Design a protein around this nucleic acid. Structure first.
Ligand SMILES: [Mg+2]
Ligand SMILES: [Mg+2]
Lengths: 1070, 98
RNA sequence: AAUUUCUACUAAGUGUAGAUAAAGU
């Protein structure tokens, strides 16, 4: 009656097993004597040509349909735009565009065989490229993806890349702002002046004012319309003709007034070190478009005060935190000033600050679009001008850019020659990365001042210039990505091309392809235009080998190192799947669905580059936790031998559980089973600071069943058992990154190492789940933070959660008998399919996502948690603090100091449940540069140093009489480190204990150092065990909630445990 | 020359990876008897693997991790961590390492 | 440092342990 045993055969699943095909007999020379690998390589190289031709025809069709289109909703848009009566109308507009597209009499052909068969061989009419578009005749399937991507532009889903979104959300806004700017900036113009020459040279038929009319936007939908409009905006040679923006610049230089300039509309990998370096020299030299953008933005941001401060803006998000850090001291000052001004309106005279109130305040803030500069000036102090500080920090960033340019004069000079290859040269890559990093830091910084766009009183005099420069500056993103992806590139390559064998309908079923098998060798037989076993009518090996010798057959051997004869360990998972395709115990579980695909990868490593470990020479072993410290093999070990030859990859799809029967909802069955269960286990996983991942398995009553670090993965094999310390490997990689000139390659190596690590942790957690029938407990990554010391960051932890979901969709034990529950044929399906990184929340089958609030800095034996705010600010606040304690006395028996507080008398302490805590000065704390401090001795020292008796009792009144400014500073300092539970020496020394200042019912303070020297411990051994323990106890609370509800209201039980309920549970569970 | 680097290969091939020296790498031959620092191309990093070219059995060294693919042909051990190189070790100060 | 491929290897000597949904954009 176990839980997991009910979650087999739930739903269907699909995978592609990749193998390697080895030509058998004289198949390779029968292929080279028919040249069946040049037609297909030629087709793979002409794919890009036909892609460009199809793009050209698509562009023609787009510019055709965007002429026969006139909207009826645009005048209403312009009339109502210059907050909810407009979005319906604009989606109506985008729907109108998309209907104009999908309503043409030729849209049917755009993504089917007709556009390669009939249309494009006519639209082109060039005997050179009609050859291309006729070569792919019958091979329409080779475009299946391309079309499915080249239609998301003809749609209206308003994603950043679509024609409707471009024309409406990004173009019409600029057109309307241009209408405003033309109505405002006029009469510095004349027909005698440059207006008539503008008209004659660029339009020649109708007036120029017509392009600032409202319903004349249905002319700039076509790229040539955008071109003529942007021409009359900026200036278009036919005789260099000046445009309106430089006529404005000519006016603003005649007399001094910052008059707004128009905004132009939008328009709807490298392969050699020399190409990379010349692209760098071209785009980023000291006279490029980008350096000119930087100079323009410098002159703008240094002329930053002659623009009306009420008009500038700053977007709301990370930009606000960074701006406060750079201006108002540190991270949260703007947020707390806004919170003060929000309490002064939405908070009564009471101290009733509730988590619902705090959450609604946070939501109202996070929904604020952007902050003006006058607002951010009101939040400031006396004699602090926010625009001066912004100007000085931006000018500092620009001067730092110029300095980095001054460190790199040589990569721009024509004399420069490359000594080494780019991937092996790291002085020049250091130069390139430093330049790109400085410029992109500037780009990401000034990205803030584009404050949400949709707002009324934008100072267009500033934003004209700003967007003119920034829309040229943001090409550094693509340049950076291209150069980086070129440098962090493996010396081999995995570029392949599918082989068809003169047959469009090839291998698409079980076609001219079959999977034979003989003994323990599985073969892929492809007919062209002893005894085996067909997949079961037999054959004769003699006559099939005769066919192979003739040429009527192309027998490949499916092979990976588990089909080898020298392989003795456990096979791969997909090898077991394949071998099971043809088994008897396999009824319909893993079946052969779809058609295979025979690719072909050419040799990427030149045999002059192959590097080898010479035979009969002792090789050093890289694993420090290995007993055997060398290895001597009787043969050679080539590095990357697989990429030094041509290889016929073979992709075989399989459909697991094609005909499921135990169909139901997984979440509700999990809830029912956790309810009806009397002792459900829970695996809490947590990201530690000294441990990559930390596991704590807790039974149904809060008792720790197991707790251990996942730093080192332990591989069992042949009965032997060898461990690998991934924390040490990661520390080595981080040290290497610290040593290297540039860290583009080091970062990719670290990322891929972490991906491999989580691929090991996946198996660890699965074998933990199928041992206890447990339920996983994971941090909810949407809400929360890990303070930058946590090794596994959020990206790789998201990848870990995704990998765990994707594994638990079909959990398999490789060692188990296949037909047995948990084996490859009957794996557990205890999780739903992955959907998105945002829907990973609040449940997924056996996985519960839990907020990580108050999990590591909480006493695990009493539930205590430091909800105070013990930071020194002034004499008055500290005096009120000291006077808010119920009692502060020196207990002489224990030689301690009792601070009997009561969280009711303190602000923002509503979550607490046992509101009356009594916390002492027990133990020693490590402050931070670190220093150990014995607390009672520090208190006695401070008291005596400031002239204070303490044997009296209740020395609060004796203590709030000190007139000194530094007494309260020292006092609140060591009062802050007394409530510090998680103590850890910064310099990596593994001392991460966790002491608590309150004593439990039995009268002993929890100290992790009393449990780290133990196996079979009842309380967490360190701070990370505490984190995992609490993340598990939250799911235990949710299980109790399930037990409280009925068997129909289970589906509605909310399990996002709130701080109030969590502290109540943690403080009464004991 | 080649003999110094052949001896260096035979020595460094046997040390455990955590003991390997810090070296200055390049692809044209490096002459420790004459190698002078202060050149803005000498960066002291730590040797990784030590393998042989398959076509002519010339020793090559992977600086840092093998997965980093910074394979060089000529190294020289130094007492240094960064662009701040102190001095050049000898063919016996590298044997003293383990 | 060998791989369908990735990660860590050498793991008892042409491999070991885990993971692996490919194609297309
Ligand atoms: Mg194996
Ligand atoms: Mg490797």
């Amino acid at each position: 009656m176990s839980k997991l045993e009910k979650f087999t055969n739930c739903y269907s699943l699909s995978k592609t097993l990749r193998f390697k095909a080895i030509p058998v007999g004289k198949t390779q020379e029968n292929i080279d004597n028919k040249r069946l690998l040049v037609e297909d390589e030629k087709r793979a190289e002409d794919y890009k040509g036909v892609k460009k031709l199809l793009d050209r025809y698509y562009l023609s069709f787009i510019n055709d349909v965007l002429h026969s289109i006139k909207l009826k909703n645009l005048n209403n848009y312009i009339s109502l735009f210059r907050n909810k009566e407009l979005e319906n109308l604009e989606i109506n507009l985008r729907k109108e565009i998309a209907k104009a597209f999908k309503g043409n009499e030729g849209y049917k052909s755009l993504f089917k065989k007709d556009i390669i068969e009939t249309i494009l061989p006519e639209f082109l009419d060039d005997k050179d490229e009609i050859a291309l578009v006729n070569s792919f005749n019958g091979f329409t399937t080779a475009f299946t993806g391309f079309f499915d991507n080249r239609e998301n532009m003809f749609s209206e889903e308003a994603k950043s890349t679509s024609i409707a979104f471009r024309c409406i959300n990004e173009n019409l806004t600029r057109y309307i702002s241009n209408m405003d700017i033309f109505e405002k900036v006029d009469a510095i113009f004349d027909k005698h002046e440059v207006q008539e020459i503008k008209e004659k040279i660029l339009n020649s038929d109708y007036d120029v004012e017509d392009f600032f009319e409202g319903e004349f936007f249905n002319f700039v939908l076509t790229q040539e319309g955008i071109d003529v409009y942007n021409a009359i905006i900026g200036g278009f040679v036919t005789e260099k003709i000046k445009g309106l923006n430089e006529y404005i610049n000519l006016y603003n230089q005649k007399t001094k007034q910052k008059l707004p300039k128009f905004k132009p509309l939008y328009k709807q990998g490298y392969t050699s070190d020399e190409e990379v370096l010349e692209v760098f020299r071209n785009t980023l030299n000291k006279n490029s478009e980008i350096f000119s953008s930087i100079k323009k933005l410098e002159k703008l941001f240094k002329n930053f005060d002659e623009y009306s401060s009420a008009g500038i803006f700053v977007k709301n998000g990370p930009a606000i935190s960074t701006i406060s850090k750079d201006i108002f001291g540190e991270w949260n000052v703007i947020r707390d000033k806004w919170n003060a001004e929000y309490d002064d309106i939405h908070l009564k005279k009471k101290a009733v600050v509730t988590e619902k109130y705090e959450d609604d305040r946070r939501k109202s803030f996070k929904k604020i679009g952007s902050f003006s500069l006058e607002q951010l000036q009101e939040y400031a102090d006396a004699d602090l001008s926010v625009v001066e500080k912004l100007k000085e920090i931006i000018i500092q960033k620009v001067d730092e850019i110029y300095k980095v340019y001054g460190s790199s004069e040589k990569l721009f000079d024509a004399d420069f020659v490359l000594e080494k290859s780019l991937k092996k040269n790291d002085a020049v890559v250091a130069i390139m990365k430093d330049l790109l990093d400085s410029v992109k830091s500037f780009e990401n910084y000034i990205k803030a001042f584009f404050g949400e766009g949709k707002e009324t009183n934008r100072d267009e005099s500033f934003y004209g210039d700003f967007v003119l420069a920034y829309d040229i500056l943001l090409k550094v993103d693509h340049i950076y990505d291209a150069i980086r992806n070129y440098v962090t590139q493996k010396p081999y390559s995995k570029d392949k091309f599918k082989l068809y064998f003169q047959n469009p309908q090839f291998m698409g079923g079980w076609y001219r392809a079959t999977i034979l098998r003989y003994g323990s060798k599985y073969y892929l037989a492809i007919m062209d235009k002893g005894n085996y076993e067909k997949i079961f009518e037999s054959a004769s090996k003699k006559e099939v080998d005769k066919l192979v010798e003739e040429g009527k057959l192309y027998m490949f051997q499916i092979y990976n190192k588990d089909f080898s004869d020298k392989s003795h360990g456990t096979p791969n998972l997909h090898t077991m799947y394949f071998k099971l395709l043809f088994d008897e115990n396999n009824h319909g579980q893993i079946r052969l669905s779809g058609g295979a695909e025979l690719f072909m990868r050419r040799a990427s490593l030149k045999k002059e580059e192959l590097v080898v470990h010479p035979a009969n020479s002792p090789i050093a072993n890289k694993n420090p936790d290995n007993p055997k410290k060398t290895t001597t093999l009787s043969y050679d070990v080539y590095k990357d031998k697989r990429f030094s030859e041509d290889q016929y990859e073979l992709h075989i799809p399989i459909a697991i559980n094609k005909c499921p029967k135990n169909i139901f909802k997984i979440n509700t069955e999990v809830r029912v089973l956790l309810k009806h269960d009397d002792n459900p286990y829970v695996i809490g996983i947590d990201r530690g600071e000294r441990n990559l991942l930390y596991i704590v398995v807790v039974d149904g009553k809060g008792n720790i069943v197991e707790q251990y670090s996942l730093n080192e993965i332990i591989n069992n094999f042949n009965g032997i058992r060898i461990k690998t310390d991934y924390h040490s490997l990661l520390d080595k990689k981080e040290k290497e990154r610290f040593e290297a000139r540039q860290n583009w390659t080091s970062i990719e190596n670290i990322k891929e190492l972490k991906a491999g690590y989580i691929s090991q942790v996946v198996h660890k957690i699965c074998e933990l789940v199928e041992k206890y029938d447990a339920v996983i407990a994971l941090e909810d990554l949407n809400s929360g933070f890990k303070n930058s010391r946590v090794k596994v960051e959020k990206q790789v932890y998201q990848k870990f959660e995704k990998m765990l979901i994707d594994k638990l969709n079909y959990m398999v034990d490789k060692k188990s008998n296949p037909c047995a529950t948990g084996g490859a044929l009957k794996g557990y399906q205890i999780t739903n399919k992955f959907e998105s990184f945002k829907s990973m929340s609040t449940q997924n089958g056996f996985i519960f996502y839990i907020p990580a609030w108050l999990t590591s800095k909480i006493d695990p034996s009493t539930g205590f948690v430091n909800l105070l705010k013990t930071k020194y600010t002034s004499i008055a606040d500290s005096k009120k603090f000291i006077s808010s304690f119920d009692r502060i006395m020196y207990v002489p028996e224990e030689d301690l100091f009792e601070f009997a507080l009561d969280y009711k008398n303190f602000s923002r302490t509503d979550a607490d449940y046992i509101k009356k805590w009594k916390l002492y000065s027990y133990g020693n704390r490590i402050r931070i540069d670190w220093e150990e401090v014995c607390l009672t001795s520090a208190y006695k020292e401070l008291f005596n140093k400031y002239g204070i008796n303490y044997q009296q009792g209740d020395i609060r009144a004796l203590l709030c009489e000190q007139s000194d400014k530094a007494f309260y500073s020292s006092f609140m300092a060591l009062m802050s480190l007394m409530l510090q539970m998680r103590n850890s020496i910064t310099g990596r020394t593994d001392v991460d204990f966790l002491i608590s200042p309150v004593k439990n019912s039995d009268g002993i303070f929890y100290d992790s150092r009393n449990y780290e020297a133990q196996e079979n411990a009842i309380l967490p051994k360190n701070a990370d065990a505490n984190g995992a323990y609490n993340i598990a106890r939250k799911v235990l609370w949710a299980i109790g909630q399930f037990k409280k509800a009925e068997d129909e209201k289970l589906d509605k039980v909310k399990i996002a445990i709130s701080n109030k309920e969590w502290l109540e549970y943690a403080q009464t569970s004991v | 020359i080649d003999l110094y680097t052949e001896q260096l290969y035979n020595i460094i091939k046997s040390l455990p990876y955590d003991k390997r020296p810090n070296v200055v790498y390049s692809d044209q031959p490096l002459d420790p008897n004459n190698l002078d620092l202060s050149e803005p191309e000498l960066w002291a990093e730590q040797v990784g693997e030590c393998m042989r070219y398959a076509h002519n059995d010339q020793p090559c060294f992977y600086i840092g991790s093998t997965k980093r693919e910074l394979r060089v042909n000529y190294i020289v051990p130094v007492i240094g961590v960064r662009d701040e190189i102190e001095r050049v070790m000898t063919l016996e100060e590298v044997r003293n390492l383990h």
